Amino acid sequence: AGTVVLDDVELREAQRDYLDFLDDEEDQGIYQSKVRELISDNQYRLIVNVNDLRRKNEKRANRLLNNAFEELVAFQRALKDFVASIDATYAKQYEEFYVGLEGSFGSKHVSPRTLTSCFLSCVVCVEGIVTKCSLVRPKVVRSVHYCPATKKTIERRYVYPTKDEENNPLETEYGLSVYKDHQTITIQEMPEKAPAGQLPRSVDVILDDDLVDKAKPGDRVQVVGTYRCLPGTFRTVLIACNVKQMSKDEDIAKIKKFSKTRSKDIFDQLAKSLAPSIHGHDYVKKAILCLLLGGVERDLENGSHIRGDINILLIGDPSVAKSQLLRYVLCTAPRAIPTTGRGSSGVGLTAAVTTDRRLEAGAMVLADRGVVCIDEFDKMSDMDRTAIHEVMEQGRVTIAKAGIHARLNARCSVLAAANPVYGRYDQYKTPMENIGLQDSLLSRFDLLFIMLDQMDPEQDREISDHVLRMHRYRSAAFMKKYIHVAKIIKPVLTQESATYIAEEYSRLRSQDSMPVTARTLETLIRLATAHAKARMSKTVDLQDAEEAVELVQYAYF
Template sequence: IMATDMVDDREMREAQRDYVDFLDDDQDQGIYQSKVRDMIGDNKARLIVNINDLRRRNETRAAKLLNSAFEELLAFQRALKDVVATVDATYAKQHEEFFIGLEGSFGTKHVSPRTLTSRLLGSVVCVEGIVTKCSLVRPKVVRSVHYCPATKKTMERVYSDLTSLDAFPSSAIYPTKDEENNPLETEFGLSIYKDHQTITVQEMPEKAPAGQLPRSVDIVLDNDLVDSVKPGDRVQVVGTYRCLPGKKGGFTSGTFRTIMIACQVKQMSKEVSPSFSADDVAKIRNFCRTRSINVFDRLAHSLAPSIHGHDYIKKAILCMLLGGVEKVLENGTRIRGDINILLIGDPSVAKSQLLRYVLQTAPRAIPTTGRGSSGVGLTAAVTTDQETGERRLEAGAMVLADRGYIHIAKAITPTLTEEAANHIAEEYSRLRSQEQLGSDVARVSRRTTGTRSGPTLL
């Protein structure tokens, strides 16, 4: 065991030297030397490193960083602390730890929550999705300091678990007595804590396979990454993929819970960027040159061509798909440019088929039904985590459909509170504030609804 520990220490020191050489790049334009100085000037403790730069300088070390994430990231962070100490020793003493964030091209490790498999455990992965749940930010003890009045001595204990980069978690027993059974007093002012938050990222609805439920992954945010996202945000998260062993009564079933430990969180644009081929552009130009047709009528007739008639409804759906221009006045007042559609009719008159065509045509459209159209399901819900017992904010259907379309089928009569929340969201085309909706929800800037309902007998 001692020989193995010596080999591990030697490999750790070798990796640390390689990362110090990478960061101390005076001979190579000094990019990261400048980034380290900017980090110190901004009073931050996280340095963003492009994996492509490391791959260009040391391809072997970049491959080890992606495949043996925990050991390599720990060595990288120690190297960053050494480099910071050479630049500003006082700043290095003020911060207990420095952190590394990764960006760039990750190749086969750029995945979605659905494609996270066991082969990626222990590796650096890049996951894209939409935030559906956010836990509260809690302080987590890193090091506790204890004082014994009887012996006048001070002791400290360092804590680590499976969400840290350390290979082995420490004991979770909080000391209350010393070895001689003397009571200990906790010095809270000298103890060190870190911010801790857990979020759930779900694969984007428009990228989920038809007929299957979207999958999700739990992601742990620590320190400066907490509160960087909210439910409804589309994010790109880079982190390490790890499993958490679970056992009951000393036995385990062999199936473990998996999480991601984030090192970089990046907001993605909510706009859907369309892609046109050269053939598409040529057809569009030929269509525009035709003067003898009414473009609006032709587009409306092309909408859901398998359904005969309903020209007026098709034109309304076309206007909803094309959207309008949102106006922002000088005083900050927003005037929405989109419309909402309510389809009411007898059974079997193609209400669902018309809106289903929208679901298949629009790049971002989410269906919901029944109680999903209530105030809680439409905007956001405060739920209780079954594992920790704490309350979490969960995004509703309209938050997930931000910058897209939401299809509410078989709308039921809501209560007064639910109806008020629905009207607020539909009137302003965005979600308002905590006082108006009853919970702190993400704002929706542009979104249209298509609702259908059968006849109501009074």
């Protein structure tokens, strides 16, 4: 329209108050030190704790949280002025500065499920995992046009201006024009918190400059921004201003007493606690308890190295608890998501969905730093079979599509099972190809158990009785707290202790004189560490690792 506002008092008051907030002269200059740091590091987004804003001026914080657009604009202008006051040249270089928000928000810290329409036009925080992204295209924000005929210049903010007043040609001044990058991604609540009963919520996220590469599909990020609606029926979008990252890291005293070795052995009873209604396979149970535990974090800055992502396969006869064991783990599963069979959504791939571009993160990707339970392995397509191989080796998933190239974290383990296609006994031929899995890459797995229905009448009596007794006319949560404690403990190895264990490793190899030994040194480390993690010890015990060797010893029969 062109009508203008002359010196809005609210805007000027906001500018003065925010400038006073940034001018930390009476204090040591925490924000002023941050401003120097950002100028030195060539970054143009200042992150401000909301708690400080409450402390200095509660009314400002209340207005900011209740009114987003104008308050954010005013605070951005205040930051521009303060930076220019500290240094004019840095301000002259750049066009407009942006401000992000961090800290703790009382009522606005919501989950995608909780984030209903009621928080419209208010700054909110959303927590979850990225489920889709797109490539990084630039979107025009200020286009400058020059007309050689009329010697006039026209500028437009945000049908593209192509015609002058009298339809003269217009050759745009690209250099004077400003382009900023743009990216559209989406989120799901964490699996452990999102109920499986009711439908999921998806919230759109738009990233501005300095945020396209900050978050990648498959990680867990915190997004804070203005929640607006792009134009009866309106679609909700969230314009972000700060994104961080997560790093998936009152009964502690109750736990500590459980960890005392003087009373009883906690490991032995714990192993039976996970497969309550399955008789036998106690050695199998110990392995399954091992799979949950184990270290998955190494001091890897800007690179990669040996990892704990090794996984356990289960092959056996139908109705022989092979299918059920997955379910028991899935139920009391920490940070674990189920997927099975075909999974026609790209089990480990983004598939680059068309007709929208979306990159639907797959099952193994959305399960970062967890355990993946997969049933009916042979049901997976050959493409998945080829694809799934690459995940376990380097620890990353590579996807190469039409222009789309991606890096995905694959810090994952697999508890997979499949029926022996048609094989019923599967003892004459080596399982390496008899289980339907074609490649010899099966050797990469940690373990391969065979649960055949061997003619063992003595066991057959106990199996029948065990089913019937389970009615229980007259400890799930305990294991959940256990895994959390071991997650922050790194039971470092001692070479002096390890030496005695390693001595019998050769004797394991020599058993064939009287199915690969060359990898076994890898699985010995993880299994031995797992035993110590149960005891919360920071040092690996000789007795603890000895049971790991026996686990290996009975691992190959």
